[PDB]
Amino acid sequence: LNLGTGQYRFPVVGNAKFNTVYILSDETTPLNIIGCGWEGNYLRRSSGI
Amino acid sequence: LISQSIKNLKGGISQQPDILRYPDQGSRQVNGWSSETEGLQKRPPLVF
Amino acid sequence: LISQSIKNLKGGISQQPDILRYPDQGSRQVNGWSSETEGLQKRPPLVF
């Protein structure tokens, strides 16, 4: 088998309101997804509360 | 520059709009099996 | 310079004066339908 263990990093570049990450595959093969992270620049100008 | 990890993926649809909904809640999910320890899996197949 | 977002709009009249009342509470509302996931909607129509 070709199975492997995480993680896997991949660029999701752009605004948060517009990027829709999704996982289609197919297959004759399993998968497991444990967690999901993201990073990114955050800048709110109006310092709230 | 911020970052955060969604620890689990349990789970499922949440047709509530995305600024309201929790993490772990995807917007669609087909043939998924959100177990307790392992997260998303494929559902096991149909023997004939 | 401050800012804040009122996440929901549920809901309705609040004749209590505005320095007392919660957010989500408008001062008047006619033909509104404050649902759970979607907020304000028009009420669905009549049929004759």
Q: Give the span between the Cα atoms of B3 and B46, in whole angstroms.
A: 40
The amino acid at residue A44 is R
DSSP code per residue over chain C: ---------------S-TTTSPTT--S--SSB---SSS-S-BPP----
The amino acid at residue B25 is Q
Across-strand partners of B3?
A39
Distance from CA of A47 to the nearest CA of B (A): 16
Which of C1, C6, C7 is most worth mutating to test chain A (most A CB atoms within 10 A of its CB)?
C1
Q: Give the span between the Cα atoms of A40 and A15, in whole angstroms.
A: 9
Experimental method reported for this structure: cryo-EM
Query: What letters, b where the CB count within 10 A reaches 16 and e where it falls short, cover C18-31?
Result: eeeeeeebeeeeee
Report how far apart, in Å, the C-alpha atoms of A25 and of each of A16, B14, B41, C34, C36 are: 23, 21, 12, 38, 33
Give the number of residues written for chain B: 48
Asked if C4 lies within 8 A of A49 by C-beta distance, the reply is yes
